[PDB]
Amino acid sequence: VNSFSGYLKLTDNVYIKNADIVEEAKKVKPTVVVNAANVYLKHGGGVAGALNKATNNAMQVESDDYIATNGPLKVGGSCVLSGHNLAKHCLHVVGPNVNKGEDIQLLKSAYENFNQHEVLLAPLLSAGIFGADPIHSLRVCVDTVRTNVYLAVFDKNLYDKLVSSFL
Ligand SMILES: O=C(O)c1ncccc1O
């Protein structure tokens, strides 16, 4: 049993809810919240900008020190950093950004990072301002992630379309 409430069950291991991931993290304090990161961990907008704002910019300060030490992530890669006031840990995962011309086949690699964590609160990778089709992102999630993932979908219209169209 866990703390997640009001989710629709899609499969054995994937759950979905119309929710603001920031507000969901604040309520649940999950072990792991996933950030929709870029390779530079520049948390300007989208999910990343919202998570970082909720940490009062402490996520960005920590991220800048990580990049200064380790250099950029890979597209499809991830790193584990603090969850600050939102979670124990934040898993920063870089999905391909279609609006930068990145290979959508890297979306599966991105989701494979989730398998290193037993339970996660996450957004749909490469959705929103990363430009991928969210229906596709949900299909890759279900077909890649084997651990227990709680997907918070910010937009109600998109949530309803994702549920209605789910095979
Ligand atoms: O549902 C999303 O894609 C989302 N986007 C931006 C900020 C928070 C979110 O949960």
- Tokens matching residue 117: 């964590």
| Structural domain of 115 | 1-167
Q: Provide the sign of the torsion angle of the four alpha carbons 137, 32, 94, 98, taken in this order.
A: positive
Instruction: Give the dihedral of Cα atoms 62, 68, 69, 74; nearest 10 deg.
Output: 90
Q: Kindly report the backbone phi and psi dihedral angles of residue 25, in degrees, each rounded to the nearest multiple of 5, phi listed first.
A: -60, -45
CA-CA distances (angstroms) from residue 26 to 61, 120, 149?
20, 14, 17
What total number of domains does the chain contain? 1
Q: Kindly report the backbone phi and psi dihedral angles of residue 10, in degrees, each rounded to the nearest multiple of 5, phi listed first.
A: -95, -40
Mutate to test the pocket of ligand 1, among 24, 154, 163 (most ligand atoms within 8 A of CB): 154
What spacing in Å lies between the alpha carbon of 132 and ligand 1's midpoint? 14
Q: Whose CA is nearest to atom 2 of ligand 1?
A: 154
- DSSP code for 72: P
Cβ < 6 Å from ligand 1: which residues?
20-21, 46-47, 50, 123, 127-128, 152-154
Q: In this structure, are residues 151 and 20 in contact, taking their beta carbons and an 8 Å threshold?
A: no
- Tokens matching residue 115: 């398998």
CA-CA distances (angstroms) from residue 159 to 6, 69, 76, 86, 124?
13, 38, 24, 23, 11
What spacing in Å lies between the alpha carbon of 46 and ligand 1's midpoint? 6
Resolution in A: 1.0
How wide is the angle at C-alpha 81 spanned by C-alphas 24 and 98, nearest 5°?
75
Helix, strand, coil tally for the chain in percent (to 5): 40, 20, 40
